[PDB]
């Protein structure tokens, strides 16, 4: 009774343009915002402690 499954159900994704790499390149801006804000907070605290 014929084929019940499509090709993408078996074949592996593209090697260089894959799901996760596209996803992470799309998330890059939000992650940059997050981690930059965290690092800036920590640095400002350390500087407020060190200068005096």
Ligand X SMILES: CCCCCCCCCCCCCCCCCC(=O)OC[C@H](COP(=O)([O-])OCC(O)COP(=O)([O-])OC[C@@H](COC(=O)CCCCCCCCCCCCCCCCC)OC(=O)CCCCCCCCCCCCCCCCC)OC(=O)CCCCCCCCCCCCCCCCC
Residues found near ligand X in the complex (CB under 6 A): 19-20, 23, 27, 39, 42-43, 49
**For other proteins, which is the closer residue by CB, 33 or 43?**
33
User: Which positions ≥6 away from 13 have C-beta within 8 Å?
Assistant: 19
The least distance separating ligand PC1 from the CB of residue 42, rounded to whole angstroms, comes to 15
49 binds, among ligand PC1, other proteins, ligand X, none (CB under 5 to 8 A by kind): ligand X
Q: Are 19 and 25 in contact (CB under 8 A)?
A: no
């Amino acid at each position: 009774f014929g084929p019940t499954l499509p090709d993408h159900a078996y074949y592996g994704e593209h090697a260089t343009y894959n799901y996760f790499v596209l996803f992470i390149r799309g998330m890059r801006p939000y992650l940059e915002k997050i981690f930059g804000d965290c690092a800036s907070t920590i640095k400002n605290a350390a500087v407020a402690v060190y200068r005096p």
